[PDB]
Amino acid sequence: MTIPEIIRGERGWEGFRQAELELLQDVIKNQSKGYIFSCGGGIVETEAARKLLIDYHKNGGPVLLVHRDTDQVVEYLMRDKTRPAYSENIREVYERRKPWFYECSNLQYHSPHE
Numbered sequence: 001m002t003i004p005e006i007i008r009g010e011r012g013w014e015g016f017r018q019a020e021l022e023l024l025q026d027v028i029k030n031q032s033k034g035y036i037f038s039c040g041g042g043i044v045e046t047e048a049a050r051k052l053l054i055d056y057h058k059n060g061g062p063v064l065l066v067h068r069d070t071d072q073v074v075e076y077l078m079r080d081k082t083r084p085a086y087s088e089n090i091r092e093v094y095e096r097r098k099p100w101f102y103e104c105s106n107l108q109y110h111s112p113h114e
């Protein structure tokens, strides 16, 4: 089943975050070398997932953070009709997540001429 479909059923956001954690757990040990992975946007707000990322980049890593302007990243997600009414504002999510991304990141890259 799909990700938005998981959000609707008994799973919700509760089970979805542990669905990520178990895949990340499995990927880190099994697919340990020779891959490049795009993680979820909110992987970083599961406490146990942060421990895995931090533990990974403390002994070799690497874990790359990509962060465009905080205005332009917002308008990409605001321009997306799939978004429940009364759900979290993107400003407050990005600002709460920012310190966790840094903590969980080994490397950093932003385009010098965006």
Ligand SMILES: O=C(O)C1=C[C@@H](O)[C@@H](O)[C@H](O)C1
Pocket (backbone or CB within 6 Å): 003, 039, 040, 041, 042, 043
């Ligand atoms: O902003 C987020 O927390 C998410 C971003 C997407 O990559 C998906 O992981 C999901 O829609 C949640």
